[PDB]
Amino acid sequence: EVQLVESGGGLVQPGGSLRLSCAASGFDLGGYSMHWVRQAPGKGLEWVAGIYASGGATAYADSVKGRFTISADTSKNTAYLQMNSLRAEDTAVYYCARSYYYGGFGMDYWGQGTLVTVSSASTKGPSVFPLAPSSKSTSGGTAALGCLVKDYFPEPVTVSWNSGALTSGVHTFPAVLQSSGLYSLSSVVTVPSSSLGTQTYICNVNHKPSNTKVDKKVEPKSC
Amino acid sequence: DIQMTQSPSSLSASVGDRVTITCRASQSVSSAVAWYQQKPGKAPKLLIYSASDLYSGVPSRFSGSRSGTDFTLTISSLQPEDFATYYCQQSHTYPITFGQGTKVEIKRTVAAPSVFIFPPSDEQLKSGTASVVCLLNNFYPREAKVQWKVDNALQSGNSQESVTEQDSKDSTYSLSSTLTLSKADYEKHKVYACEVTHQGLSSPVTKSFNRGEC
Amino acid sequence: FPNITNLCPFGEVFNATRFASVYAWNRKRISNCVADYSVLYNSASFSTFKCYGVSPTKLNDLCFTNVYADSFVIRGDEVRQIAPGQTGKIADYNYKLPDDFTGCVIAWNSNNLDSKVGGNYNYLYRLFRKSNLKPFERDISTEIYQAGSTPCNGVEGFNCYFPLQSYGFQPTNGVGYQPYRVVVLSFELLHAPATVCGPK
Ligand SMILES: *[C@@H]1O[C@H](CO)[C@@H](O)[C@H](O)[C@H]1NC(C)=O
């Protein structure tokens, strides 16, 4: 079972440095070339750098030439990518992969990938606001309700409905980067209008980077 | 420094169909092309290498062909797991370059969007900013237009929308458009409406609400 | 007719100890002899036995000017390329059959003969080439393949690849990637004495 595991990802300010590691198991780096491929949110794949483990020869993409440096260690059987003078354009999910020889072959095994965010903004906790179901909702129809997460910068966020009890008719939209530099997304669910008064609905939001976990209940306005 | 032009950019087809995807290289690359598949939130999975060589543990329906400098990836019959994005990649001349990408979506009958409007919470008003949300869920095709109208006046520059991926079971899209503005500017107007234009709609829908009423 | 009764050396080819690499496929000329083709098919110990331009079923009645037995090793997945009008690394860069091919193509698995613990790297194939191969052409050159604009000066590296690469004939491999021995019988018919014939 060949395996490639990434590490060293995180949050860094513009112009900073970050070292990504890629540990390999189930095979020897010898005779292989380790590559780093990055993918910006909702965009294509872009090759960055590559290295022949045995000889030590390296190759870089024009966009990151000079700033990034790729290395490898045969005893540790791991590959590294030092990233200096980072820019906002470099924010992306970084994967490490392997290929046989200097070229001509595909990438057999990829790591799961690590997210790298480059922003001047600081890590902030999410603000949770309810989205109550409209009072004027048809009885035969099904009223919709939801939770809104605003102003959290570190992208990773998880949401659940009733501690995982509601797994049907739920739609959690992807986050959007605001002009302020903080992220904001919303999650919604469609439930029958009759069960609005009877049942109780809770959105559970977890922000691992800032270590902020909260829950909020949704109820009609009534006024 | 070779450029790989991939077509089609997007493709919609039904289960059991035969699909073809093409990648043309700027220069000759011998047979150093490879084809990968990527699903949301997952690393790319290698499908084909050296143009026409199957990878271990990969369904036999996937095939690869090379005619001159044109490369082709073919699916004999589609299966629900084959709905994902597909890339081509060349490893002939460095820097290695991927294709633009080809998204494959499950075809579905036209459906109209269920549209809802959510006013800003009072807890948010305490902070000083008001966010109005407009949700339109369970519709197909992806193409849709959302227009924010405040007292029948179009609002531009303060709206942001996001779209979900096709539902596992519904096979339909959903969209959420948020309009954020300061409490002072929010209190200046009284009517807030979210006009929606879709292919599967005779006329534009217009869910709205009035500030200070429930 | 030959006017002499000398069995042809087919055992030398099919039962040879070691086979050649597909990039340098071996070829044995066969003339001035007689041999029973149908014995091969009857043996039925082969996995692929496809003939183009002639019926395989007991067609020893025919006599040919010369015969050619071409032998090499490839993967199982690649066997499908050893036929007329096919494309692939093997067909393009290693061993090409003409579209007007009259002959037979025989292939059998050899995992026990051509596998070694930790891999057998004795069987190579050509991976890079500027142009496709003409039919029945052989290229044994080992010159470094220059892919970039810069010259290579005979050194291995990025954009400077050694043209031949080794098969990963692991013993734990799938059938598609297991070694397979291939013999291609070509029947050269010309306006010349028939030096090869069938029995009797
Ligand atoms: C290969 O060897 C076996 C046993 O010696 C024999 O029966 C078979 O016919 C041989 N192949 C040929 C072409 O003679």
XYZ file of C-alpha atoms and ligand atoms in Angstrom:
651
model
C 0.000 0.000 0.000
C 1.814 3.074 -1.306
C 0.862 6.231 0.578
C 1.726 9.937 0.379
C 0.854 12.260 3.271
C 1.127 16.053 3.187
C 1.932 18.261 6.161
C 3.061 21.770 7.010
C 0.100 23.611 5.526
C -1.382 26.586 7.309
C -1.990 30.330 7.239
C 0.726 32.824 6.312
C 0.758 36.556 5.650
C 1.784 37.977 2.262
C 5.543 37.835 1.819
C 5.976 35.098 4.426
C 7.440 31.614 4.152
C 6.001 28.125 4.582
C 7.568 24.667 4.260
C 5.382 21.818 3.007
C 6.369 18.206 3.664
C 5.317 15.054 1.805
C 6.104 11.766 3.542
C 6.095 8.611 1.425
C 5.463 5.040 2.547
C 5.384 1.718 0.750
C 8.010 2.720 -1.818
C 11.495 4.191 -2.129
C 11.977 7.635 -3.658
C 14.863 6.298 -5.761
C 14.213 6.159 -9.492
C 11.176 8.414 -9.018
C 10.432 12.116 -9.417
C 8.339 13.946 -6.823
C 6.126 16.793 -8.053
C 4.073 19.512 -6.359
C 0.763 20.425 -8.016
C -1.415 23.256 -6.724
C -5.107 23.945 -7.326
C -6.658 27.322 -6.579
C -10.250 27.283 -5.253
C -12.603 26.370 -8.088
C -9.850 26.518 -10.716
C -7.727 24.151 -12.770
C -4.601 22.271 -11.753
C -1.221 23.996 -12.090
C 2.160 22.291 -11.900
C 4.669 24.031 -9.642
C 7.901 22.076 -9.186
C 9.493 18.656 -9.493
C 12.637 16.855 -8.384
C 14.459 13.633 -9.269
C 15.154 12.149 -5.841
C 18.291 10.201 -6.782
C 20.275 12.757 -8.777
C 18.854 15.857 -7.114
C 17.977 17.641 -10.355
C 15.107 20.115 -10.071
C 12.591 21.843 -12.327
C 10.225 24.723 -11.570
C 7.337 26.503 -13.239
C 7.889 30.010 -14.548
C 5.227 31.515 -12.283
C 7.018 30.559 -9.044
C 10.609 30.430 -10.296
C 13.088 31.807 -7.769
C 10.607 32.052 -4.906
C 9.987 28.333 -4.338
C 12.602 25.636 -3.753
C 12.057 21.871 -3.900
C 14.142 19.279 -2.053
C 14.106 15.622 -1.054
C 15.631 13.259 1.500
C 16.276 9.592 0.735
C 16.841 8.342 4.289
C 13.706 10.113 5.525
C 12.062 9.130 2.215
C 10.233 12.461 2.067
C 9.983 15.495 -0.218
C 9.859 19.177 0.735
C 8.691 22.414 -0.884
C 9.962 25.613 0.725
C 7.800 28.575 -0.318
C 9.241 32.057 0.233
C 7.951 35.499 -0.734
C 4.402 34.174 -0.868
C 1.642 36.125 -2.599
C -2.146 36.087 -2.469
C -2.116 34.520 -5.942
C -0.425 31.455 -4.404
C -3.364 30.589 -2.122
C -4.434 27.055 -3.031
C -4.601 23.342 -2.190
C -1.123 21.832 -2.598
C -0.745 18.153 -3.531
C 2.408 16.043 -3.780
C 2.617 13.232 -6.332
C 5.163 10.898 -7.905
C 6.098 9.899 -11.445
C 8.523 7.352 -12.850
C 11.645 8.792 -14.484
C 12.191 12.474 -15.297
C 9.167 12.427 -17.600
C 6.883 10.488 -19.896
C 4.839 8.866 -17.115
C 1.760 9.907 -15.177
C 1.304 10.622 -11.479
C 0.462 7.318 -9.788
C -0.242 8.417 -6.210
C -1.323 11.791 -4.835
C -1.553 12.897 -1.239
C -4.866 14.093 0.130
C -3.582 17.669 -0.094
C -3.060 20.603 2.251
C -4.657 24.048 2.089
C -2.398 27.125 2.034
C -3.993 30.550 2.538
C -2.078 33.796 1.959
C -3.866 36.839 3.369
C -3.129 39.858 5.532
C -6.356 39.175 7.445
C -6.101 37.562 10.879
C -7.902 34.448 12.090
C -11.360 35.389 13.383
C -14.276 33.474 14.850
C -17.499 33.068 12.870
C -20.652 35.058 13.613
C -23.797 32.914 13.335
C -27.143 34.509 12.443
C -30.472 32.712 11.949
C -32.611 32.612 8.802
C -36.106 31.998 10.146
C -38.831 30.472 7.949
C -41.277 32.989 6.526
C -44.490 33.341 8.514
C -46.520 33.358 5.273
C -45.601 29.844 4.142
C -48.086 27.575 2.385
C -49.329 24.668 4.492
C -49.173 22.159 1.647
C -45.769 23.498 0.665
C -42.610 23.163 2.734
C -41.091 26.225 4.400
C -37.319 26.734 4.229
C -34.985 27.808 7.032
C -31.284 28.132 7.638
C -28.163 29.384 9.373
C -25.720 32.059 8.139
C -22.007 32.131 9.022
C -20.287 35.479 8.425
C -16.863 36.982 9.080
C -14.556 33.992 9.560
C -11.237 34.156 7.764
C -9.609 30.689 7.971
C -11.479 28.870 5.232
C -12.043 25.431 6.864
C -15.528 25.311 8.398
C -17.931 22.472 9.150
C -21.698 22.609 9.620
C -24.216 20.024 10.807
C -27.967 19.947 11.413
C -29.222 18.585 14.747
C -25.901 16.890 15.540
C -26.205 14.927 12.298
C -29.890 13.999 12.573
C -31.026 15.939 9.471
C -29.182 14.551 6.437
C -31.941 15.076 3.846
C -32.963 18.139 1.861
C -29.981 20.061 3.255
C -27.904 22.417 1.107
C -24.678 23.967 2.415
C -23.373 26.491 -0.102
C -19.650 27.147 -0.582
C -18.070 30.153 1.078
C -17.395 33.443 -0.709
C -14.501 35.822 -0.074
C -15.834 39.203 1.019
C -14.299 42.574 0.199
C -13.208 42.747 3.841
C -11.156 39.578 3.376
C -13.315 37.371 5.617
C -15.372 34.426 4.393
C -19.147 34.066 4.642
C -21.379 31.120 3.733
C -24.888 29.903 4.505
C -26.564 26.534 5.018
C -30.276 25.844 4.568
C -32.800 23.034 4.905
C -36.343 22.414 3.661
C -38.756 20.907 6.196
C -42.549 20.474 6.223
C -44.510 23.506 7.380
C -46.627 21.461 9.803
C -43.595 20.363 11.846
C -42.356 23.955 12.268
C -44.015 24.527 15.637
C -43.575 20.957 16.863
C -39.914 20.307 16.025
C -36.813 22.240 17.100
C -34.041 22.926 14.568
C -30.420 23.663 15.492
C -27.449 24.557 13.281
C -24.080 23.420 14.669
C -21.044 25.310 13.358
C -17.432 24.288 14.004
C -14.391 26.434 13.135
C -11.318 24.325 13.862
C -8.674 27.001 13.043
C -9.946 29.462 15.662
C -11.297 26.584 17.799
C -14.802 28.080 17.915
C -17.788 25.725 18.160
C -21.340 27.054 18.541
C -24.971 26.046 18.036
C -27.996 28.212 17.249
C -31.721 27.467 17.096
C -34.082 28.570 14.327
C -37.634 29.699 15.086
C -40.305 31.814 13.365
C -40.506 35.559 13.932
C -44.227 35.717 14.854
C -43.859 39.394 15.855
C 6.535 25.002 -22.888
C 3.569 23.216 -24.478
C -0.090 24.225 -24.216
C -2.869 21.616 -23.928
C -6.262 22.756 -25.249
C -9.084 20.653 -23.786
C -12.642 20.314 -25.089
C -15.471 20.400 -24.223
C -15.302 22.817 -21.283
C -18.566 21.407 -19.897
C -20.620 18.375 -20.883
C -24.025 17.031 -19.834
C -24.926 13.424 -20.619
C -27.157 10.636 -19.341
C -26.153 7.424 -17.593
C -25.059 4.711 -20.004
C -23.915 7.167 -22.685
C -20.617 7.009 -24.581
C -18.469 10.076 -23.925
C -15.429 11.525 -25.690
C -13.016 14.236 -24.513
C -10.253 15.764 -26.636
C -6.909 17.414 -25.842
C -4.749 18.982 -28.555
C -1.129 19.886 -27.839
C 0.672 22.925 -29.215
C 3.713 20.826 -30.191
C 4.486 17.146 -30.637
C 4.666 15.354 -27.283
C 5.157 11.773 -28.577
C 2.856 9.727 -26.270
C 3.418 11.428 -22.910
C -0.210 12.397 -22.238
C -2.126 11.254 -19.158
C -5.754 11.522 -18.057
C -6.929 12.148 -14.482
C -10.314 12.260 -12.740
C -11.152 14.532 -9.803
C -14.269 14.564 -7.612
C -15.105 17.461 -5.271
C -12.793 17.680 -2.275
C -10.618 14.776 -3.428
C -7.179 14.488 -4.977
C -6.966 13.680 -8.696
C -7.065 9.953 -9.455
C -4.917 8.724 -12.340
C -6.903 7.066 -15.136
C -4.623 6.742 -18.183
C -0.917 7.275 -18.844
C 1.367 7.326 -21.893
C -1.707 8.042 -24.030
C -3.302 4.578 -24.223
C -2.226 2.551 -21.162
C -4.770 1.592 -18.501
C -3.828 2.003 -14.846
C -4.252 -0.822 -12.356
C -7.583 -0.773 -10.548
C -9.391 1.287 -13.192
C -12.613 0.204 -14.963
C -12.029 -1.146 -18.473
C -14.570 1.293 -19.938
C -11.929 4.045 -19.896
C -9.806 4.108 -23.050
C -7.231 6.446 -24.552
C -6.205 7.173 -28.125
C -3.656 9.307 -29.971
C -3.958 10.583 -33.551
C -0.940 12.699 -34.415
C -0.895 15.485 -31.833
C -4.568 15.002 -30.858
C -5.407 12.878 -27.809
C -8.759 11.373 -26.901
C -10.293 9.873 -23.766
C -13.352 7.679 -24.267
C -15.936 6.196 -21.915
C -17.847 3.273 -23.411
C -20.725 3.418 -20.904
C -21.276 5.953 -18.117
C -21.894 4.940 -14.500
C -23.115 7.154 -11.635
C -19.568 7.241 -10.232
C -18.134 8.605 -13.508
C -19.739 12.040 -12.986
C -16.799 14.265 -12.034
C -14.173 16.524 -13.606
C -11.512 15.244 -16.008
C -8.083 16.662 -16.847
C -5.381 15.873 -19.393
C -1.702 16.417 -18.636
C 1.524 16.246 -20.646
C 4.933 15.223 -19.281
C 6.969 15.639 -22.480
C 8.486 19.130 -22.169
C 8.814 20.951 -18.866
C 7.095 22.870 -17.350
C 4.354 20.227 -17.457
C 0.924 21.632 -18.300
C -2.585 20.400 -17.540
C -5.740 20.972 -19.545
C -8.384 23.545 -18.751
C -10.713 20.822 -17.483
C -13.929 19.095 -18.546
C -16.870 18.911 -16.137
C -19.337 16.063 -16.728
C -22.823 16.595 -15.304
C -25.783 14.227 -15.126
C -28.574 15.317 -17.464
C -31.986 16.004 -15.949
C -35.379 17.381 -16.942
C -35.942 21.120 -16.588
C -36.992 22.074 -13.055
C -38.049 25.448 -11.678
C -36.346 26.921 -8.597
C -38.001 27.066 -5.199
C -37.238 30.665 -4.172
C -37.253 32.061 -0.627
C -36.251 35.396 0.920
C -34.729 35.765 4.398
C -34.567 39.194 6.091
C -31.690 40.229 8.357
C -31.738 39.001 11.930
C -32.071 41.516 14.753
C -28.936 40.131 16.412
C -27.104 41.196 13.249
C -28.732 44.635 13.366
C -27.202 45.073 16.826
C -23.755 44.872 15.217
C -24.657 47.508 12.604
C -24.796 45.495 9.341
C -27.795 43.880 7.629
C -27.563 40.844 5.337
C -30.538 39.882 3.166
C -30.428 36.334 1.794
C -32.154 34.924 -1.282
C -32.265 31.161 -1.788
C -33.311 29.339 -4.947
C -32.923 25.578 -4.610
C -33.628 22.410 -6.610
C -33.487 23.736 -10.159
C -31.847 22.686 -13.431
C -29.969 23.764 -15.611
C -27.273 25.540 -13.589
C -27.781 28.778 -15.527
C -29.866 31.270 -13.539
C -29.987 35.008 -12.860
C -30.627 36.794 -9.553
C -31.321 40.546 -9.460
C -31.593 42.555 -6.241
C -34.191 45.348 -6.298
C -34.600 47.844 -3.445
C -37.757 49.928 -3.903
C -37.669 48.871 -7.573
C -34.085 50.144 -8.017
C -31.346 47.725 -9.032
C -28.568 47.306 -6.468
C -25.055 46.585 -7.741
C -21.690 46.041 -6.084
C -22.865 44.540 -2.776
C -24.284 41.129 -3.780
C -22.419 37.809 -3.696
C -23.729 34.397 -4.739
C -22.594 30.788 -4.472
C -23.827 27.584 -6.115
C -23.841 24.017 -4.828
C -22.790 20.920 -6.731
C -25.362 18.546 -8.192
C -27.255 16.732 -5.461
C -26.410 13.073 -4.953
C -30.079 12.050 -5.241
C -31.870 15.093 -6.685
C -29.259 15.827 -9.384
C -30.300 19.493 -9.122
C -28.524 22.762 -8.377
C -29.094 25.362 -5.673
C -27.974 28.975 -5.377
C -27.671 31.460 -2.515
C -27.267 35.211 -3.089
C -26.444 37.455 -0.119
C -26.835 41.252 -0.209
C -25.000 42.986 2.640
C -25.237 46.659 3.559
C -24.918 48.935 6.562
C -27.758 49.328 9.042
C -27.966 53.039 8.220
C -28.343 52.324 4.498
C -30.678 49.401 5.229
C -33.043 51.650 7.206
C -33.136 54.161 4.326
C -35.429 51.944 2.208
C -38.566 49.938 2.935
C -38.920 47.255 0.216
C -36.371 44.521 -0.551
C -36.960 42.098 -3.426
C -35.065 39.252 -5.097
C -36.061 38.907 -8.753
C -35.182 35.543 -10.309
C -34.932 34.621 -13.999
C -34.612 30.956 -14.982
C -34.890 28.913 -18.160
C -37.719 26.858 -16.675
C -39.893 29.858 -15.818
C -42.593 31.569 -17.863
C -41.937 34.916 -16.144
C -39.420 36.207 -13.582
C -40.325 35.388 -9.983
C -40.091 38.209 -7.421
C -40.132 37.257 -3.742
C -39.938 40.382 -1.572
C -40.401 41.719 1.953
C -40.989 45.072 3.661
C -38.846 46.377 6.510
C -40.696 46.760 9.799
C -43.267 44.057 9.004
C -43.392 40.305 9.583
C 7.978 -27.806 -54.273
C 11.071 -28.333 -52.097
C 11.963 -31.894 -53.201
C 13.528 -32.464 -49.750
C 12.020 -33.493 -46.405
C 13.594 -31.533 -43.538
C 11.460 -30.482 -40.577
C 11.554 -26.736 -39.889
C 13.135 -25.392 -36.659
C 10.015 -24.064 -34.958
C 11.110 -25.369 -31.554
C 14.116 -23.044 -31.694
C 11.746 -20.055 -31.762
C 8.777 -20.921 -29.532
C 10.766 -22.814 -26.876
C 13.836 -20.546 -26.884
C 15.348 -20.015 -23.445
C 15.390 -16.201 -23.503
C 13.277 -13.860 -25.622
C 14.303 -10.495 -27.037
C 12.990 -7.092 -26.012
C 10.214 -5.718 -28.196
C 12.268 -2.689 -29.259
C 14.882 -5.090 -30.663
C 12.503 -7.857 -31.743
C 14.240 -10.991 -33.023
C 13.596 -12.426 -36.485
C 14.379 -15.943 -37.725
C 14.301 -16.747 -41.433
C 12.774 -20.095 -42.421
C 13.467 -21.716 -45.797
C 14.385 -25.059 -47.376
C 12.249 -27.092 -44.988
C 8.773 -28.488 -44.316
C 6.625 -28.036 -41.225
C 3.124 -28.755 -39.949
C 1.415 -25.517 -38.944
C -1.754 -27.223 -37.697
C 0.250 -28.905 -34.910
C 0.671 -25.474 -33.311
C -3.041 -24.629 -33.284
C -3.875 -28.167 -32.152
C -1.539 -27.767 -29.163
C -3.920 -25.052 -27.908
C -1.440 -23.903 -25.241
C -1.529 -20.296 -26.532
C -3.763 -17.454 -25.348
C -3.917 -15.510 -28.637
C -3.766 -17.151 -32.083
C -5.127 -14.785 -34.734
C -4.413 -15.030 -38.462
C -5.014 -12.373 -41.122
C -5.109 -13.189 -44.826
C -5.348 -16.967 -44.389
C -7.554 -19.492 -42.616
C -5.853 -21.014 -39.545
C -7.884 -24.222 -39.620
C -5.466 -26.847 -40.968
C -4.038 -24.700 -43.777
C -0.787 -26.558 -44.416
C -1.622 -27.193 -48.083
C -0.033 -23.852 -49.007
C 3.620 -23.280 -49.913
C 5.466 -19.987 -49.507
C 8.701 -18.517 -50.822
C 10.014 -17.722 -47.336
C 8.753 -17.530 -43.766
C 9.687 -15.140 -40.968
C 9.305 -15.865 -37.247
C 9.495 -12.662 -35.185
C 9.705 -13.072 -31.408
C 9.594 -10.626 -28.497
C 8.043 -9.951 -25.074
C 5.427 -7.364 -24.082
C 2.559 -6.892 -21.623
C -0.827 -8.548 -21.910
C -2.678 -5.267 -22.399
C -0.317 -4.552 -25.305
C -1.001 -7.806 -27.187
C -3.988 -6.132 -28.859
C -1.515 -3.818 -30.631
C 0.248 -6.631 -32.521
C -2.254 -6.574 -35.386
C -2.824 -4.621 -38.611
C -3.851 -0.982 -38.336
C -3.350 -0.563 -34.588
C -1.909 2.326 -32.584
C -0.043 2.534 -29.304
C 3.449 2.853 -27.903
C 4.321 -0.647 -29.129
C 2.730 -0.384 -32.578
C 4.096 3.130 -33.174
C 7.589 3.027 -31.653
C 8.569 -0.661 -31.521
C 6.931 -3.239 -33.831
C 4.580 -2.312 -36.687
C 2.595 -4.673 -38.903
C 1.538 -3.541 -42.394
C -2.109 -2.997 -43.238
C -1.826 -5.629 -46.000
C -0.493 -8.171 -43.507
C -0.769 -11.848 -44.445
C 0.329 -13.998 -41.531
C -0.406 -15.227 -38.030
C 0.096 -13.739 -34.565
C 0.616 -16.024 -31.559
C 0.906 -14.942 -27.935
C 1.048 -16.711 -24.591
C 1.598 -15.754 -20.969
C 5.071 -16.338 -19.528
C 4.771 -15.050 -15.959
C 6.669 -18.048 -14.573
C 9.451 -17.772 -17.162
C 9.945 -13.986 -17.294
C 9.305 -12.849 -13.699
C 11.838 -12.497 -10.899
C 11.440 -11.621 -7.234
C 11.786 -7.862 -6.925
C 11.196 -7.291 -10.641
C 12.805 -8.221 -13.964
C 14.320 -5.182 -15.697
C 15.832 -7.091 -18.638
C 12.892 -6.405 -20.989
C 12.781 -2.858 -22.365
C 10.521 -0.921 -24.721
C 10.934 2.333 -26.627
C 8.975 5.203 -25.062
C 10.004 8.332 -27.004
C 10.358 8.729 -30.761
C 10.115 11.649 -33.167
C 8.154 9.727 -35.822
C 6.164 6.523 -36.095
C 7.776 3.300 -37.285
C 7.323 1.926 -40.784
C 6.107 -1.687 -41.014
C 8.634 -4.407 -40.146
C 11.228 -1.803 -39.131
C 13.609 -2.119 -36.181
C 15.244 0.730 -34.243
C 17.968 -0.072 -31.698
C 19.401 3.439 -31.290
C 20.024 4.612 -27.721
C 20.540 8.325 -28.418
C 19.172 10.662 -25.759
C 15.761 12.052 -26.715
C 15.813 15.863 -26.677
C 12.319 17.177 -25.915
C 13.083 20.798 -25.064
C 14.580 23.481 -27.254
C 17.957 23.242 -25.499
C 20.485 20.561 -26.495
C 21.058 17.567 -24.235
C 24.718 16.722 -24.993
C 24.157 13.091 -24.007
C 23.042 13.587 -20.393
C 19.898 12.338 -18.664
C 17.534 14.850 -17.111
C 14.384 16.875 -17.562
C 13.547 17.259 -21.269
C 16.471 14.849 -21.918
C 15.154 11.294 -21.639
C 16.780 7.969 -22.426
C 14.481 6.520 -25.108
C 14.148 2.981 -23.703
C 12.405 2.129 -20.429
C 12.036 -1.130 -18.534
C 8.972 -3.284 -17.981
C 7.941 -3.675 -14.364
C 7.512 -7.434 -14.598
C 6.664 -7.908 -10.938
C 5.446 -11.420 -10.034
C 2.480 -9.983 -8.079
C 1.227 -8.002 -11.085
C -2.159 -8.168 -12.761
C -2.748 -10.025 -16.001
C -2.701 -6.820 -18.030
C 0.847 -6.153 -16.807
C 2.225 -9.705 -16.834
C 4.856 -10.658 -19.430
C 3.636 -12.263 -22.643
C 5.750 -13.891 -25.345
C 4.721 -13.118 -28.926
C 5.674 -14.864 -32.178
C 4.596 -13.396 -35.529
C 4.709 -15.729 -38.532
C 4.926 -13.835 -41.829
C 4.456 -15.741 -45.097
C 6.575 -14.113 -47.813
C 4.982 -15.127 -51.131
C 6.897 -14.054 -54.238
C 7.766 -15.134 -57.784
C 10.576 -17.408 -56.626
C 11.099 -21.104 -55.827
C 8.959 -22.320 -52.923
C 11.497 -23.266 -50.254
C 8.904 -23.804 -47.483
C 5.974 -26.194 -47.832
C 3.459 -28.221 -45.875
C 3.631 -31.920 -45.038
C 3.966 -34.552 -47.755
C 7.804 -26.593 -27.349
O 8.109 -27.677 -26.421
C 7.130 -28.716 -26.226
C 7.831 -29.786 -25.417
O 9.180 -29.928 -25.846
C 6.614 -29.251 -27.562
O 5.555 -30.180 -27.367
C 6.159 -28.095 -28.441
O 5.652 -28.575 -29.679
C 7.342 -27.172 -28.674
N 7.016 -26.149 -29.655
C 7.231 -26.322 -30.966
C 6.829 -25.185 -31.861
O 7.727 -27.354 -31.410
